[PDB]
Design an enzyme around this catalytic site. Structure first.
Site, PDB file in Angstrom:
ATOM      1  N   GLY A 121       0.809  -1.209   0.000  1.00 37.34           N
ATOM      2  CA  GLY A 121       0.000   0.000   0.000  1.00 37.34           C
ATOM      3  C   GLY A 121       0.849   1.268   0.000  1.00 37.34           C
ATOM      4  O   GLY A 121       1.949   1.302   0.539  1.00 37.34           O
ATOM      5  N   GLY A 158       0.033  -5.032   0.551  1.00 32.49           N
ATOM      6  CA  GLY A 158      -1.126  -4.974  -0.311  1.00 32.49           C
ATOM      7  C   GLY A 158      -0.969  -5.751  -1.549  1.00 32.49           C
ATOM      8  O   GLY A 158      -1.965  -6.222  -2.091  1.00 32.49           O
ATOM      9  N   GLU A 191       4.704  -6.735   7.629  1.00 29.09           N
ATOM     10  CA  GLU A 191       3.879  -5.767   8.350  1.00 29.09           C
ATOM     11  C   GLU A 191       4.260  -5.534   9.819  1.00 29.09           C
ATOM     12  O   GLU A 191       4.241  -4.392  10.279  1.00 29.09           O
ATOM     13  CB  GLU A 191       2.402  -6.159   8.256  1.00 29.09           C
ATOM     14  CG  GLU A 191       1.793  -5.961   6.877  1.00 29.09           C
ATOM     15  CD  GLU A 191       2.276  -6.988   5.873  1.00 29.09           C
ATOM     16  OE1 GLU A 191       3.151  -7.806   6.230  1.00 29.09           O
ATOM     17  OE2 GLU A 191       1.781  -6.980   4.726  1.00 29.09           O
ATOM     18  N   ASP A 243      -2.180  -8.091   6.591  1.00 23.16           N
ATOM     19  CA  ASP A 243      -3.613  -7.941   6.335  1.00 23.16           C
ATOM     20  C   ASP A 243      -3.851  -8.324   4.916  1.00 23.16           C
ATOM     21  O   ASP A 243      -3.185  -9.242   4.376  1.00 23.16           O
ATOM     22  CB  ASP A 243      -4.142  -6.533   6.773  1.00 23.16           C
ATOM     23  CG  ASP A 243      -3.572  -5.381   5.925  1.00 23.16           C
ATOM     24  OD1 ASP A 243      -2.483  -5.513   5.351  1.00 23.16           O
ATOM     25  OD2 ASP A 243      -4.237  -4.346   5.825  1.00 23.16           O
TER      26      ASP A 243
END
Length: 344
Positions: free
Chosen positions: A70, A119, A142, A150
């Protein structure tokens, strides 16, 4: 037109029998923005009913990275300022897209060169047919930034053989193409020089994929030690690592020591709730529980400050070590969100 999208960060179009998504932001390693995620999800949704679309192929420009994560610098500003809502909304639409891809009614093929992390895993590693090549390196780093893996990351991690999900998830360790397949983040190895042809063939609605052996990785032989070292809880694991004079144990311990203890503890707890049999929505739901609360209740903002904004690599976490995180505190982070709960 591709001409009208010559300034767009993602190329969305039909080519013959296929809906085509090409990440087109190679200068930022194809990092995902809110807008890209919105556009990809709209395209997919519209292709469900389109009978001209027999399959979707997702790819990306540039040799360095399918998608490196991301674009999360967005989120720190609108974040330390008390506006948590930006991140909460973004994750909501992202996780919906991850689910859309996973359960898509038509075949989806992903082709993931170079770096895929964060992401990017959400985008490519839930496809039905996931192709890796020689340059492919996949990780979920992460926890180093104060988040849990996630975007359905935990689903894939939980399904990996033995305790490999724990190791990948708590340490941010890399998988090359052979290890990505073994661990269940991808399905096939195909030399990257063959990919332009393959995609042309796929565009013509031929779903046959060529058969090649992946280069051997480290996981099959590391499996037994991974299984011994990452049993049990975070109260047990760091001591077991410390007693083990091996590259594996030593690299894992450093990762543990540097990462957010709260994120490590929550990751492990999610993986344990999930087990291998859970669907992707259970995982997205649990991830959201953490990430919805992360800006105000966990280490994410400080994690981003250290790694991305100030780049001092000196995060000061809410806890001094993994052993010090209280179970009650993990339980609160992973408690139901009630009316704020993720929905599809």
């Amino acid at each position: 037109n591709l001409y009208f999208q010559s300034m767009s960060d993602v190329l969305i179009r039909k080519v013959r029998r296929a809906g085509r998504i090409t990440l087109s932001r190679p200068a930022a390693l194809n990092a995902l923005t809110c807008a890209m995620v919105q556009e990809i999800d709209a395209a997919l949704r519209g292709w469900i009913g389109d009978p001209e679309v027999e399959l979707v192929v997702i790819d990306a420009e540039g040799p360095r990275a399918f998608c490196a994560g991301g674009d999360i610098a967005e989120l720190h500003g609108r974040g330390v300022a008390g506006d948590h809502a930006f991140g909460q909304d973004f994750w909501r639409v992202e996780y919906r897209m991850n689910d859309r891809i996973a359960a898509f009614p038509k075949p989806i093929v992903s082709l993931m060169q170079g770096f895929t992390m964060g992401g990017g895993v959400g985008l490519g590693c839930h496809a039905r047919h996931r192709i890796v090549g020689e340059t492919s390196q996949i990780s979920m780093p992460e926890c180093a930034i104060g988040l849990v893996p996630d975007v359905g990351g935990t689903h894939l991690l939980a399904r990996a053989p033995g305790r490999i999900g724990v190791w990948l998830g708590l340490t941010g360790a890399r998988m090359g193409p052979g290890d990505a397949i073994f661990a269940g983040f991808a399905d096939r190895f195909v030399p990257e020089a063959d990919w332009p042809d393959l995609i042309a063939a796929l565009e013509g609605g031929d779903l046959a994929l060529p058969d090649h052996a992946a280069p051997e990785g480290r996981l099959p032989v590391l499996q037994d030690e991974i299984d011994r070292l990452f049993a049990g809880t975070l109260a047990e694991i760091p001591a077991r690592l410390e007693a083990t004079d091996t590259p594996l144990a030593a690299e894992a311990l450093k990762a543990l020591r540097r990462s957010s203890p709260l994120a490590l503890a929550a990751t492990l707890e999610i993986l344990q709730r999930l087990g291998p049999s859970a669907g992707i929505r259970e995982a997205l739901d649990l991830e959201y529980r953490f990430t919805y609360r992360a800006q105000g209740q966990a280490d994410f903002l400080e994690g981003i400050r250290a790694a991305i904004i100030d780049k001092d690599r000196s995060p000061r976490w809410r806890h001094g070590d993994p052993e010090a995180v209280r179970p009650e505190e993990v339980a609160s982070l992973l408690a139901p969100l009630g009316p704020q709960a993720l929905t599809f």
